[PDB]
Each structure stands twice: as structure tokens, then as C-alpha cells.
Design a protein around this ligand. Structure first.
Ligand SMILES: [Mg+2]
Ligand SMILES: [Mg+2]
Lengths: 317, 314
């Protein structure tokens, strides 16, 4: 087996909730690459919005601090509750970040329960997987999974009989605290996950800008790897002959993986990460003579998030 | 960037290669490039062995690609024409609608006298590339030499940066030339080379004559489009379509596009094996079959040659 340490480029930031004391976001803006907030949770037996989420998320956005949020899961044998909780989380996220906006960072499902024997590994993973399917279908945003190394170990490494590791394609935020002497020094490779995306290495950290002992995390080498890419800039198009010539400024994200281009919302092609142009054959589209033509584009990154908005260029035609 | 334990390896051949034994090459080469055509003489010529060599590589399952010996000029129409000609010849060798297993290659080695500006040369290559990729939906790789790049100002175009730096680069730099560095230097705005022709005088079992030899990417897949997706399945439940497939296995896999009756339904990342589609987003009459189709794509933007389909009866 092998393991994955942090490195000099690793990003860093806390996660917080309504019980975090004395949080000065202006101070955190100077020392944190990102902040995670609790949005909601069902740990008490019903859905509760975190009582500081709206305030915390508004101030992080105001200060330009990359901000994401998590839902504390209550899994069960009834898979309808995964759909309900996913829908509730989707609703709360928009309350915090805006209509149709689910945060700067990956939305997170926080799974820490149950730790008795009440669910089989198949039942627990099926519940998470259903939550993931609903969440991503509804938002077009990737969902990151938070859980602890101990918890994974209680559930057989999240290995499902007959099915391998169904959650191993989720981004992983793994908790393994170095303050526990029996823990390894760095996160081992587990659950079929090739890599961790974030590592929560303490629940008792000291960081200027949070008064209470705080959860601290290592992240990817680039903040871009936690966020969707930005909208494309410099979009331009012209018609010559029977072709539409489209060009744009290259997106700059470290995790950029390509672009999709559309003509009147019909797909026109997929380009790789270094691309800055496409030539489109007009005959493939119903383009009434004299009517305007909408060219639009989205970037997407390695883990499959897209530009929140599609930059547009209207050809008068 | 040097070669390394994973680097692929293979010759490039043309009609002047002597005593070629493809059975031997199938055991010692990851890939073979062939000359398809050239325009150096002022007229399109087809390499006299290309069809024979391509057929034998396909018969033995040797990954096979081909190149066009360019004749750049100040006349940009000639770039469109040579691209269209290269497109035709490739299909003669590889089959209708088939442009080879490996990146098709534009081979640029002329002119070396003072007869073209850097802007003119780069614009010609760029126009060939645009026409070729537009017509084939296949990425074009550029072959050229380190000396040639230096001759044309590092392919830096005044006011335009390095317009060719997004092309895969097959760079020739012969270690037998003492003034050359021992590994390719960074040039032309290219972050990396895709292939490195390191000799024109190599000795390779299965080729009788001194032969061009090349280091390629760490994975043969990085020279080829991804395979068609397999294991595609779909069903309807409620107002949704649940689609799943087997994961493609290419080392350079980058994702999938899924379509509903040829309409775009989404892009998935490389580890994905399912998508849930809301029927409400597509025109889906009761009693009309629904075509689900999918393609894989790789990091440099080539696609599965065919889309795998699954027909739902609805
Ligand atoms: Mg990203
Ligand atoms: Mg490939």
C-alpha cells in the first residue's frame, strides 16, 4: 500500500459551523485559501439549517474568500431519505449563496453516522450514492464526500459485496487526525480512492481569526481544483462562407480540461484545455437567413464542473 | 523532458525503407508511422508503399499512423488543398472515414532558404491544421526539426504569441549531431513534446536500412483516440433516464459526452460510469424509441471513432 502526504503547494483552510466562536473573516482572508461552512444537517433527527450559515456565507462572498458548505447526513435503510436530504441541502445552499448557486467549492456530504451496526456497508453506500445521484442530477455540480478514516474502516473500506467501491469516483475529503497516536502519519490509500482531495488533519487547531479550537484542512495544490472554472472571456465569432469562426481567450485554471461550444444552445463541439478556437459548419444547424445566431461556451475542469455561466456572442446574421 | 521507462518506441518508414518485416516490428515497436503523401514536387504524390504498409500494420494490430510531407507557401489556399488531399489519401490507406490509429501528422521540413517569413510559415501550418481538424474531427500532430524551429524565430509570430503551441509536437533532434543538446530543449511555446525523433540512422530489427527512430508518450493511448465505450445500459424510471457504462481504460482518458437522440445531454469526467437524465429536458414523444449514445474523449481532444448506442423503446 501507499499513502499521500500534503506538500509545499497544498492549500489550507478551516471548516466552521454555528459553534465556531469568534470568527473574524477579515483575518481568515489573509491566512486561508478556502473556508468550508456547515449549511445544514439532519443529525438531530430533522433537517436544520445551520444558524450561522447564511451570515457566514454572505461575508465570505463579500470578502472574496472561496467558500463551500456541507450537509451533515443522517443515512438510513430508506433511500427516499437520501433524495429528501439532497433536495433540502440544494435548497439551503441557494439560500446561502444565491438562486442557482451552490458555492465556490465542492458542495460536501458529511457522513459520520451511524457507527453502530444498524446499516450494512451496502445500505450505507447505497444511501450515499443515491444522495450523490440526486444532488448532481439537480445541480450539475460535483458532490465531495467527507468522512473519517476510522468510519471507512467500520464499513469494510466502503467495499460493497459484488460492486467494488461505488463511491471511489467522488472527490474525497478524508479526516485522519495526527493527534491520535494510533493513526498513521499521513492518510493511507483506502476505499478505492486513488487520491484525497482534502485532508482534515486536526479538530483542535489554532488559527488566527477563529477563537475556538478549529478543524483544519489541507487541500489541492491549486484552489482551482476545488472550484468550477470561471466563465470564458474574450469570446468572438464571425461568419465567412458557410462556416462560423469562433475564438476566445484561454481559461487559466490549473485544472482546466476543455470547453463545450454551442450554436443556439445546440452542441457544436468539445475542445481540449489548450484550445482557443473552433470552426463550425453552419449546415449542421437550422440557421434561418437574417436571424441572429447565439454562440455560447463553457469551460470545464478535470473533475467535471463547468463555468457557472455560458459566455455568449450574438452574430447579427 | 527525457525519455523514461514508460516511453513508447517505434520507427517511421516510407517507400524507401528496405527489407521491412512487420512480424518482427510487431514484437519490438509500440507504433509505426508511415509516409502517406507529399507535395514537395509541386504536385500531390502518394507514397508507393503506404497502402501496403498500412494494411499490414492493421492486419497485425500494430498501431499505425501516417504523415504528409508539406510544401508550405505564401498561398494559404494551398494549405486547404494539401489538407483535403491528405484526408483523401489517409482513407485510401486506412479505410473510408478512417484517418489512422495514431495522430495524423503534418511533416514540415521546408523551405530552409530565405523564402518565407515566420508569420507566413506559421499561418500556413495553422490553416492546414484548421482545415484538417474541421473536416476529420481528428487532432493533427506537427512534425518538424529543432533546427527548423530555430530558423523560424522559435515559431514566435509577431503580435500573436505561439499559435501552434497547442498542437501535439513530434520534434526531431538528432543526438548524433554534437552541437545539439542531449534532450530536446523547450521551444516554440510547447510545454512538452509528444514524440522525439532522436536519430535518422537507427538500427532496428525488422528494418534492413538505417531508420528513423522515435520516443513517444508514456502510453500508446496518448497517440490514439479512445476506444468506443462498452457496456452501455439505460432504463427509464419515473420521468428520468438512468444511463450507465463500463469505464474506458485509456491512460489519457478525459471524459465522456452523452446524447439523447443526438442532442447533447452532458459531459462526464474520466472516472464517471453513469448519468441520470431528466426526460423533461428533451423532446421525447410517448411511444417513440429514444436513442442513448455516448463517446469517450482523451486529454488532447480526440473522440471515440464511433458512438456506442442503446435504444430505449418508451
Ligand atoms: Mg476546478
Ligand atoms: Mg488518446
Amino acid at each position: 500500500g501507499f499513502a499521500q502526504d500534503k506538500n509545499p503547494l497544498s492549500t489550507f483552510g478551516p471548516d466552521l459551523n454555528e459553534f465556531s466562536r469568534d470568527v473574524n473573516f477579515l483575518t481568515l482572508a489573509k491566512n486561508s485559501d478556502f473556508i468550508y461552512l456547515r449549511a445544514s444537517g439532519s443529525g438531530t433527527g430533522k433537517l436544520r439549517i445551520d444558524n450561522k450559515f447564511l451570515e457566514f456565507a454572505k461575508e465570505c462572498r463579500r470578502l472574496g474568500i472561496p467558500c463551500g458548505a456541507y450537509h451533515f447526513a443522517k443515512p438510513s435503510k430508506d433511500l427516499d431519505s437520501a433524495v429528501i436530504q439532497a433536495d433540502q441541502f440544494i435548497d439551503v445552499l441557494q439560500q446561502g449563496f444565491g438562486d442557482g448557486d451552490y458555492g465556490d467549492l465542492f458542495p460536501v456530504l458529511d457522513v459520520e453516522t451511524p457507527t453502530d451496526k444498524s446499516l450494512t456497508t451496502t445500505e450505507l453506500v447505497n444511501w450515499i450514492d443515491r444522495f450523490r445521484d440526486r444532488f448532481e442530477e439537480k445541480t450539475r455540480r460535483r458532490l465531495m464526500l467527507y468522512t473519517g478514516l476510522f468510519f471507512i474502516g467500520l464499513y469494510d473500506d466502503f467495499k460493497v459485496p459484488g460492486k467494488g467501491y461505488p463511491l471511489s469516483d467522488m472527490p474525497l475529503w478524508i479526516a485522519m487526525y495526527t493527534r491520535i497516536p494510533s493513526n498513521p502519519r499521513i492518510p493511507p490509500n483506502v476505499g478505492g480512492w486513488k487520491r484525497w482531495t482534502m485532508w482534515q488533519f486536526t479538530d483542535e487547531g489554532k488559527l488566527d481569526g477563529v477563537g475556538s479550537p478549529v478543524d483544519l484542512n489541507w487541500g489541492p495544490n491549486s484552489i482551482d481544483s476545488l472550484m468550477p472554472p470561471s466563465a470564458v472571456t474574450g469570446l468572438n465569432a464571425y461568419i465567412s462562407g458557410n462556416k462560423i469562426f469562433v475564438n476566445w481567450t484561454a481559461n487559466k485554471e490549473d485544472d482546466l480540461n476543455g470547453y463545450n461550444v454551442f450554436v443556439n444552445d445546440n452542441y457544436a463541439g468539445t475542445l481540449p484545455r489548450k484550445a482557443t478556437k473552433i470552426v463550425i459548419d453552419k449546415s449542421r444547424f437550422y440557421l434561418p437567413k437574417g436571424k441572429p445566431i447565439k454562440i455560447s461556451i463553457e469551460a470545464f475542469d478535470i473533475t467535471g464542473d463547468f463555468s457557472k455561466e455560458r459566455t455568449e456572442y450574438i452574430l447579427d446574421n
